[PDB]
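so ive been stuck on this for like two days lol. basically i have the seq below and the ligand is cholesterol hemisuccinate, smiles is in there too. i just want the complex predicted, nothing fancy, no docking runs or whatever. if the output looks off dont worry ill sanity check it later, just need somthing to start from for the group meeting slides
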Amino acid sequence: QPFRSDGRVIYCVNIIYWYIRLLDIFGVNKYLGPYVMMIGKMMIDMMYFVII
Amino acid sequence: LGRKIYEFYNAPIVKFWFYTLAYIGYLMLFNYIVLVKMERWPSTQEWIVISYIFTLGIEKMREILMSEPGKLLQKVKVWLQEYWNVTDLIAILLFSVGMILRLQDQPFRSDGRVIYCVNIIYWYIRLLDIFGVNKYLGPYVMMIGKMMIDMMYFVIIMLVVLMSFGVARQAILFPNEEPSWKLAKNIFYMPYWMIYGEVFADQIDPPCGQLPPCKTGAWIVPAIMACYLLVANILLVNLLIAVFNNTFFEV
Amino acid sequence: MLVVLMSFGVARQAILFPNEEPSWKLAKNIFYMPYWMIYGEVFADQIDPPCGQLPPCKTGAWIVPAIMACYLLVANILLVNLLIAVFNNTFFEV
Ligand SMILES: CC(C)CCC[C@@H](C)[C@H]1CC[C@H]2[C@@H]3CC=C4C[C@@H](OC(=O)CCC(=O)O)CC[C@]4(C)[C@H]3CC[C@]12C
Ligand SMILES: CC(C)CCC[C@@H](C)[C@H]1CC[C@H]2[C@@H]3CC=C4C[C@@H](OC(=O)CCC(=O)O)CC[C@]4(C)[C@H]3CC[C@]12C
Ligand SMILES: CC(C)CCC[C@@H](C)[C@H]1CC[C@H]2[C@@H]3CC=C4C[C@@H](OC(=O)CCC(=O)O)CC[C@]4(C)[C@H]3CC[C@]12C
Ligand SMILES: CC(C)CCC[C@@H](C)[C@H]1CC[C@H]2[C@@H]3CC=C4C[C@@H](OC(=O)CCC(=O)O)CC[C@]4(C)[C@H]3CC[C@]12C
Ligand SMILES: CC(C)CCC[C@@H](C)[C@H]1CC[C@H]2[C@@H]3CC=C4C[C@@H](OC(=O)CCC(=O)O)CC[C@]4(C)[C@H]3CC[C@]12C
Ligand SMILES: CC(C)CCC[C@@H](C)[C@H]1CC[C@H]2[C@@H]3CC=C4C[C@@H](OC(=O)CCC(=O)O)CC[C@]4(C)[C@H]3CC[C@]12C
Ligand SMILES: Cc1cc(NC(=O)[C@H](c2ccccc2)N2CCCc3ccccc32)no1
């Protein structure tokens, strides 16, 4: 301690990333892949929206 | 006059409206018996509802027997090819199970009440099913179907994002909960009502250390809360705006 | 919407509050609670209050969060978006 709780925090943000990798693997499905590229282009447009 | 009354009452539109009025009265008496009490023996309204269900089951057996094929398993499969017949049979067995439980003593009576409520849910969905006769409601019904499929795929993606945020929140804050099934309750509880309005303003960054001491990374939870709800609400909800608009053109 | 909302309200007021005698306030509750549930405020205090730890839990008190989630989900998203699409395709003709 106190580095153990910091390691726990890093473990949680890595969970976040590995669920995003589970979102990445959904490009095999023909119904989820279009939604994934929606997430990408809508993320760019929301970056400009987030500025305004 | 006898030919007049017999020619009137055998008309299919008269049959449709009489069945609709009887279904309306059925839904009324079902509402009455799920709000008002039940004892060791049922009331007259609940006996009428039981009679409704059992005669509907007898009529469904008449539908199965008097169909077009001649083999028993073939005509049963032909009748079960329709989805509404499948859910109707599931509800009939559910009501009979609930009535068997309710005719027994406590604590099975409250379980029968629970089954009665979820059967109410189903019979209101059947009232939604009957709205395919109207030229203005039928398009809305097929919207409900195709939008339900698209929301199933949306619910998969939303469930991934929401589950990740809930796991991160319940692992940063509350860092000392032993193995219990209530952890899943928390991670599915908090973000799901976070989407829909109420952000739980008291629960986000409560004052600590000024009060219990702050957990390590307690400031990370406002940041991942902001990031999660942001991309969740705006990205996926708008996404569903675009999805349901491009579904409506074809329909 | 009235069909779906009425079914959820009847189910909620029949699972929870299982001991209310015949009174016209039952209709008040079943039209009260889901209608403001749609529009914002989800009544966070009233959903899964701690019981048995406090009055004992009614049977199936855990079913009300599930049917709450299912109801508002399909209610809010399915019908409200549906009205987005409906009002967009009305605006073209007008
Ligand atoms: C990835 C998606 C599709 C599902 C995510 C599910 C998780 C939220 C679940 C699945 C595995 C679950 C765990 C499986 C085992 C247990 C032991 C369980 O312990 C007991 O019930 C006490 C008795 C015993 O230890 O056997 C408490 C819940 C817990 C930690 C569960 C917590 C919730 C978890 C992580
Ligand atoms: C692929 C998609 C469409 C699946 C959608 C369904 C799931 C998101 C649902 C169905 C079954 C649900 C589970 C059914 C039962 C429980 C036990 C429940 O345990 C408690 O609440 C603790 C005990 C208690 O306090 O009653 C926690 C939620 C959980 C894991 C539920 C989490 C959400 C689940 C996985
Ligand atoms: C996306 C655009 C349009 C707006 C920008 C939003 C975020 C950049 C803001 C909104 C909420 C903010 C957070 C609100 C509260 C806190 C807690 C604060 O920590 C504390 O007050 C001490 C620890 C604690 O008590 O939790 C650190 C900054 C932080 C994470 C803020 C960081 C910046 C955030 C994430
Ligand atoms: C299906 C749609 C279109 C309407 C749904 C309406 C229901 C919510 C209503 C219609 C029938 C009503 C019931 C009709 C009769 C009564 C008796 C009533 O009792 C009294 O007023 C006391 C005096 C007496 O018993 O006559 C209390 C309300 C109650 C249970 C009503 C509760 C609310 C109900 C179920
Ligand atoms: C087909 C659609 C478009 C019809 C839309 C109208 C209905 C949804 C409204 C119109 C009349 C309303 C009813 C008028 C009066 C009452 C009595 C009211 O009784 C009480 O609140 C108890 C007494 C009290 O505390 O004042 C409960 C709601 C109810 C049944 C209302 C429920 C909602 C109703 C049926
Ligand atoms: C649809 C996708 C995108 C997200 C998944 C949402 C549901 C699957 C979650 C959200 C709210 C959850 C419920 C929140 C609280 C509870 C109460 C819990 O029961 C108790 O805590 C004990 C009884 C009580 O006190 O009510 C059982 C699990 C349950 C129904 C949970 C089951 C899973 C639910 C319905
Ligand atoms: C109990 C109970 C259910 C019920 N009603 C029906 O389940 C249904 C119906 C619903 C609304 C309007 C009209 C009819 N119905 C009755 C006879 C079998 C059948 C076949 C095909 C389509 C509908 C239908 N009445 O009492």
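Residues 138-172 of chain B form the longest helix (35 residues). The CA atoms of residues 8 and 72 of chain B lie 35 Å apart.
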